[PDB]
Design a protein around this nucleic acid. Structure first.
Lengths: 94, 96
DNA sequence: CGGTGCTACAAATTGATAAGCAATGCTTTTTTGGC
DNA sequence: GGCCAAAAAAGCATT
DNA sequence: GCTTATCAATTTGTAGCACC
């Protein structure tokens, strides 16, 4: 399910909420979550999950193709932890 | 941290939706994602990232307190693979 | 609009197993803006 | 909403 | 080829948000 497909589905279901509105809303919500993380702040959606940032220490890395070294500055990368409800509804195995 | 209430609020302000619609929309947004996931479908949100499902076999685990060895029962988990665009937006972020 | 009780959530334990990644050119997929 | 070409983004290699 | 994440059970302080 892509972002556009997600907008479709939401639109199809709701027959009282305009498709264009659903589109602007999703895009806006995603943009809101992205800038939220960029500002170094967490996203906590109870039952769905939470987004936070993990630090990566500077490190001498490598161009996996050439083998040439590359000096890597420390940084932050995204991290998602699925919430209980989401963990369960997704886990088909017992 | 960002919460549905705050997301609802932005939809209300920035898009002048009714507080009613701004609330249900946020809820549906996440709900639709959980749904596609519980049906075993991958979710790819361009500009943000993908929510992928992985089936993990059983493996050795234990009780961190006591130390009693316990197996980590097999399961299907949800992983999030941030995209490049998002990754770039967050690399120099400074934890507020 | 606002108070709040329920509880998911975060964190911190150990240690075997699994997932992810540095650079980057080329290919593929998705989105975009016009009709 | 559909179609199209262009552009953005992701995917692949291996990542 | 090396670094980081996953996960077990239990406790304990915190906070999302449904429901009034």
């Amino acid at each position: 399910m892509t972002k556009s497909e997600l907008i479709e589905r939401l639109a199809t279901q709701q027959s009282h909420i305009p498709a264009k509105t659903v589109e602007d809303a999703v895009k806006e919500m995603l943009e809101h979550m992205a800038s939220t993380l960029a500002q170094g702040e967490r996203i906590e959606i109870r039952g769905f999950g939470s987004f936070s940032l993990h630090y990566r220490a500077p490190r001498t890395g490598r161009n996996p193709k050439t083998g040439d070294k590359v000096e890597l500055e420390g940084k932050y990368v995204p991290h998602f932890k699925p919430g209980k409800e989401l963990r369960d509804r997704a886990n088909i195995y017992g | 941290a960002l919460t549905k209430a705050e997301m609802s609020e932005y939809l209300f302000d920035k898009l002048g939706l009714s507080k009613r619609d701004a609330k249900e929309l946020v809820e549906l947004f996440f709900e639709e994602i959980r749904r596609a996931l519980e049906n075993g479908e991958q979710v790819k949100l361009s500009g943000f990232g993908n929510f992928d499902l992985r089936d993990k076999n059983q493996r050795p685990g234990r009780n961190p307190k006591t130390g009693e060895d316990i197996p980590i029962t097999a399961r299907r988990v949800v992983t999030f693979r941030p995209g490049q665009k998002l990754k770039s937006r967050v690399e120099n972020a400074s934890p507020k």
